[PDB]
């Protein structure tokens, strides 16, 4: 199993919408069927916080400016007025078929 | 100087107990329709019956200790076991049943009588499965700890009843074999047990409809000018005490919901029928009695319960003590559904020897039936799409005694059908069969030629 | 008339009609609960015919042998008996001795046999 | 909020076994999963292994298999973890940290009066609170 | 001329064979389908010896009673029946008054049998 | 002054109904055979019947209302159904197949006639899943909307019939209780109904081989010196007619596959068959008729056809009208193996009123049948090792005209095997069953002595 | 003696007893074992006496018959088979020539019945 | 000169073969644990045997081929298919056993007779599951390569001998119909076959006990003097031998276990028991015989060997030669418990014509069984809830001499059961059926006048 993630960097101004996909060699519907995706914002020198699980769900106290959507292979992340706070690392990762493996991950930073 | 001579075919005969057979009429077979009781394979019986008068003779006629009902109580279980024997056995209901009450039209009464369940269930292949719904009385589920679960799972699983054989009751007729024969008692006065001065000898008996019921029978035989009370000892309580009226009181039961039918396909080749929604609001059960016609049947009954108690006691009639709801409250199954109704509003009463408001009694229905009052067996009767009305007569009733408290001044009476036999010694208790002995002996002046 | 019509009647008024209860003596649930039946009436139908037939009554509905009757069995009149007295009330008189009475006949009926080949013989 | 720690930062030689502690507050393994991961700078996460609350299925990536064990006390007072075969490109922070799972049916094959032929399976759906974690360099 | 040999043949020749025809009355699919023949057999033999038997011809193939003929069922000479006619023809021609002489013959043997009962009553 | 005399043991009989046992003979009952017909409770039979000659006597006949054909169909049912008791049922093949088509060594014709399955099935242990497969022909699996199933799924599932027992037909005698007679007609001209001036009684018929065909009798008795018709009415258009040849048409039957019966191992103690690998190519299944001797057989049918129907007229022979496959196709089993042959190259001809090709049939192969027109039970014949060849007699064969719009211009024969009782009423058409009435009446010049 | 009881006894001493044999002709698994085989005695016994009943002697333990004893059978001193043999040795003896007699008794019932018309016939 | 004359009824006889029926004592009534051997439809037995002695008469029989007792061994098989028709068919413990050894309390020579195993199984909700164990003995599990199965799952599924009805012999009566007798040789020789002085008719025969048994006779039926040697062809070495002890010799066979029955819930209404744990220590089944008797008892048994075989050879006792548990061990059930005793210890010894320890017998008890050496039927016997222990006579014995090497010095015997219904021929050999001819001619001078 192979799991990659594109673009590797994207500049975004303050204020604008981005747009992040992960996806894996694996079909999301190879055998069972289902998402099973989790975002994670990986904060530089803290801990990850999960934001939104399986695109499909919002968890408690997360703002509701993030929303996930898509079908198939192939899904995006959307947010509204993207903040430096954001900046970071982003990595997806699948449930779907054992053994379970991070993604190799991208980094986005302010224009400057 | 006399001589022994043997005469062959005098009329002799002596108390015997034999295996009758069967003998049923043509309407029934010919309708080519399936029956419980079948009596397809049953003989026809004969264009008409010889009823013989005999004169000058008088038989010792018992019914309390006849044979004719013990096997005839066996014989009616072997049927109605023998038709469950091909249908299909429910036992891929016996799951988590996932259940909530229903409120869509609900009558004050009627709030949790049935619940509303859905669960797994399979389906002709292996691999598949399909989730269905159904509405389930309340009598029939058991909560597990919400998820319920059938009553019947964890003592034995239930064979469905066929959807093409009816319950229907039909007269039978039990003829004797070659070499007995059938005494009948024409006496107007016979009180069970004694000397009977008016006797016949008949081919075959009557048609008796197969009826089961308790605390009251239904569709049976009347009497003559007065009612008669039939009883093994009348001091002794633990004996049942029978009643036949001389003439019926028509009681009318319904059920006014408009269940619908529907058939859930389980396994290859088999089917269970459930119950999908009810048409229009639901009512509860119940049975209409007049009350000017009630009042003078237990005026009647009064009257002769007086010879052998007196003159003076006060007699009074209480509801049934407690129990299981099979022998509590009276059971019938006309219509080809099973209702349990609580005859309370019928023996409250005081008697102490000095308008049509139509009576209405509250029923609960079931389908987890167990009706030989056996323990391992169980039937499920498939629902009945669309409103069903059922009239019937009333030609008998059951009671009990309570006791005494060394005072006669009042005696209470109790409605009870403990013993599933006593419905059928209401029809046979006329009836006797006897063994033909032909060879006899008297003396005589006859010498042997040589 | 019929099945045991004059069961009440008098002896010997009963007996001037023995041949109509004579021809009354033959003629799954319900598969083995017949069959059965059936046998029973064919097999009770032979025990009757075959002790009737070794006393030399075989084909008689009134026969009478040479044995004598036993006063102490009952001892009246004949007036008492034939057309005043009813069958069924008669055979519980001599219910007692029925089995004794019978091994008579049997016996009886062998010395003719018997006698007759020698006689027979003799000729 | 619940409250976690997690064993003190230790430094070992190459090729050598080492021993980690981890507890939870409140008994919380009983209805919770537990993952380990690891993270290194400049590079994305890494997951190591997991146990399911039930305890009865176990696994690892192919990788790892036959190097790596897991072993839990009587109770569930305490977890213990064995390492093998450290790298001076292993490098990386651990962390304590609990799991959620989604458990359906597969496959099934109705057996016909006994029990039925079932093929469970185990998809991870969410990663739970994490720990402030554990750090551990390989040197020499 | 075996079993029913002489079935189309003179009515008097027929008469001939009786014992051929009288010998062959009697002698889990096929488990309770050929036991349930064996029962009708024995009791269908049965019913003639008894009906045969109450009319004073228990054990003779051939027998004569008292009971004279009457004119209205045929009136043609013997000779015209014998010597020419067929048993079978015979049965389908006096088919309609067959129970009424056997019901005859049933009070013949008990007028014969009380007379024969009182014949040596003095003696 | 004629008196009446009776008589005891006359040869008079009276047309009757029983129940004719079984008998057959012991020369094959040592081998052990275990014929779905169980011979065995059969009573041996005499070495040679005992042909009776019964002269100057006329028996009227009636082979539609002859009640020994419907008894026989009766037996031959009861027969089949008990033998499949003890077979194991193939309830756990209901199961989601994954097949495709097979093109390893396929001709053009028969281009998707059979499938290669895969299904997934548990073994001994039941919770391990074991994967197998089989070949499948194409009328015994049905799609869902890739994925097939098989067609008996939705209406029962089926027993296979176990490889011990075997479907050859074999000859068994009917013969009566005692005191009951069986008449054989050996009038030559004897059409369907009428005076029998040649009759004669025997212990019992003959053997007759219980064959089930369709449009085509085979194995059965030959009527000599005349090809014969019979027919109840013949203006009737809706009435079967039946014609029996006199020389018989050879017919032979193979089926090219060499298939290799491969065993499964389901639950315990029980094993399914599959078909296992093709070796060598795989060719359709054909029957082959000599056209010399057939076309000279329908002349001669022909000749006689026009007797009932005037001798100008035009007579025409088209294939089945069509629909069920059973019943529009020549139907039979040799081996074992059940064919299902098209027989629109025989019946495909007209005549005017005035090179050994060896005509091909083709035929396909069913694996699950009912062969009774019953719904609710359904067999699995499993699948045979190696080549099979099978040769017979076309000994008869049945038609059913068609429409009759004109007056009198010409006549349209087409086969039907609508009724299944027509295979065996051609070969008890000879015989009756009577009663025999010992006792009769006749005057005399006779006296008793006293 | 009991049933049997005589077995071993002469010819002479046996004839004592023929009665007590003849009333014993007649008298889920076990319930088939039970029917089969009442189903059988009733109708072995029933052959003998309808084998036994058209030679003349059916109602007669002893019966004697026209038909001339052929001395092919034998031929040896009446002495010498009755007060000093068995029954169970005299059936070995005549084995094999017990169903040639049994068809020379039919003829001679089926002639004597005959003659008895014509007895009365002259008168 | 000599006129022939029909007797009927006279006292004659010939051999032949009937279906007797059954007949035992009512005081099984009053037991009323519905007894395997159901005596519920055996007629009632008389209330004392009426044995006829007939005087000057001599019989031949022989007990080899006397059909009594093929007729019983049929029965017996028949009895107990009929019991095991309406219990627990235990199909659902086909599944995968993870066993472990029991080391609790353990006697080194019961180092692995019997494991610990778990297994997964449905409650009475079919969704619902539930994990149990019970101990099984080592010669009902096999391992797969800890997988472990049951013997019998790749055989046939084992029906639950329902744990009501008993094993228990009682006697019973095997009589004949009317028209048949029984004769009894009373004659104190009478080994096999010959003529035996004294023969006496009886009713019918005795109680005999359906014990079954191999290489051992227990509570039959003992010699009234001296010890007999039974068999076709003494000379053959592949015949068996049938002895019978003059006195009997106690056997006390115990099972010191504590074995406590749990009741496991499968399916609705079912129960499946098994051996829950074990109380106390655990030893080895064993089985005590005293050496002081049997020495003295086979001394007995040597000197009648003798005499076929000339008074100065050698003879000498030993062991199964080979063969599995069956047929190598002396099997029995003692009060529904399955015993297997090696019984190895007993011939063992060497005479060449010239205290009270107890000897021990170690044994082995089997949960699954056959017991009528047929494939495809198997029975679970559940366990018995405490000690058990039961005493026995040992009456007979079966030896079967065996080798050859052209000389007579010593000769061998071993045990031998291959024939199991060696075991009623003992008690049989005594009885021989027979049909009585009552019509008989014989010429004398009388002449029928008319
Ligand atoms: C459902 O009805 C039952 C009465 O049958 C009642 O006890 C229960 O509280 C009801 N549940 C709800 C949620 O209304
Ligand atoms: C009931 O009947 C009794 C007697 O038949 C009568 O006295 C009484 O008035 C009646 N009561 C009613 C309410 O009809
Ligand atoms: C009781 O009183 C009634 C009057 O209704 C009378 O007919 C009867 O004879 C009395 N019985 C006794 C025992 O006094
Ligand atoms: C029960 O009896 C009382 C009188 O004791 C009566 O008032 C009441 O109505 C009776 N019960 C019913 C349901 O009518
Ligand atoms: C039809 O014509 C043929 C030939 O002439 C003739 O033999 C036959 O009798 C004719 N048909 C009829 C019914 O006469």
Redesign the interface.
Known sequence: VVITQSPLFLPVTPGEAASLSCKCSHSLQHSTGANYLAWYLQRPGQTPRLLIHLATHRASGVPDRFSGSGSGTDFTLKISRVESDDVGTYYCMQGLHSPWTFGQGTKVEIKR | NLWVTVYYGVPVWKDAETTLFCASDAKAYETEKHNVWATHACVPTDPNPQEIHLENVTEEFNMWKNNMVEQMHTDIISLWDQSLKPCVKLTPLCVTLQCTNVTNNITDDMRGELKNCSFNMTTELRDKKQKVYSLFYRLDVVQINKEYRLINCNTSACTQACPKVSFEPIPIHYCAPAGFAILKCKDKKFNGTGPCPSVSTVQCTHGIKPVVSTQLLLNGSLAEEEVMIRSENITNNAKNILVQFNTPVQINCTRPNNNTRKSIRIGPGQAFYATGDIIGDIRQAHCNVSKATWNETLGKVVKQLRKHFGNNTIIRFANSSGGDLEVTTHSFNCGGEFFYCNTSGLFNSTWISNSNDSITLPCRIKQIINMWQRIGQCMYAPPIQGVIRCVSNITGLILTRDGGSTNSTTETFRPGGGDMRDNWRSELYKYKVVKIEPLGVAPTRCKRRV | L????????T?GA??????????????????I????????????????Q????????????????????NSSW?NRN?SE??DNM???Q??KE?SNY?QI?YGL???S??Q???N??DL??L? | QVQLVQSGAEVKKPGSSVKVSCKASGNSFSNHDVHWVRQATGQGLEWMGWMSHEGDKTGLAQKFQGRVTITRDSGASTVYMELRGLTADDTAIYYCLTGSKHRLRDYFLYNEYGPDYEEWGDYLATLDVWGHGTAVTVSS
């Open positions: 019929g099945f045991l019509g004059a069961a009440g009647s002896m009963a007996s001037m009609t023995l041949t109509v209860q004579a021809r009354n003596l033959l003629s799954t649930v319900w598969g609960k017949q069959l059965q039946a059936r046998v029973l009436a064919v097999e009770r139908y032979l025990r009757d075959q002790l009737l037939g070794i006393w030399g009554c075989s084909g008689k509905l009134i026969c009478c042998t040479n044995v004598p009757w009952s004949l008996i034939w009813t069958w069924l008669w055979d001599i029925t009475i006949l049997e016996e009926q062998n003719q046999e018997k007759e080949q027979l013989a000729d």
